[PDB]
């Protein structure tokens with residue numbers, strides 16, 4: 001049932017779009033992460049992140065973006081992207097969801113789903 005996904009329960013599109021917007025305002029202010037995004041079109045990147053999060057939170061049928069591993073392979077191989085950056089990024093999202101008032105159980109579910117992206121991203 002549409003209402004029963006994590007996506008729907010956390011407030012659906014308005015909630016995910018707001019979370020992604022705040023998430024990237026924190027990331028571009030973070031000296032440890034901002035250099036990775038300094039020449040990225042952040043309007044397009046926000047849209048891509050909304051689409052990905054919507055998919056893994058159960059809000060869309062089938063992801064139409066690029067494979068996560070392929071999308072970050074160049075960053076890991078040539079720009080020093082590493083597991084510590086992943087932890088920093090995850091913590092920005094957790095703090096964002098907390099600030100936006102996401103219920104603790106839903107925040108835990110969302111963040112476990114983000115944790116599941118780690119092997120995908122690093123090709124482990």
Ligand code: HEM
Pocket residue numbers: 033036037040045048049052065066068071072075081085086087089090114117121
């Ligand atoms: C923590 C979970 C993460 C998720 C869910 C995630 C998800 C995504 C998605 C969906 C895209 C767009 C791919 C596309 O369709 O083109 C992307 C691109 C990108 N990601 Fe991540 N990512 C994560 C971690 C990171 C980390 C740790 C870094 C570096 C600190 C990072 C840096 C980037 C950059 C710079 C791009 C844009 C690359 C480009 O277009 O040139 N991501 N990510």
Ligand SMILES: [C-]#N
Pocket residue numbers: 049
């Ligand atoms: C990756 N954002």
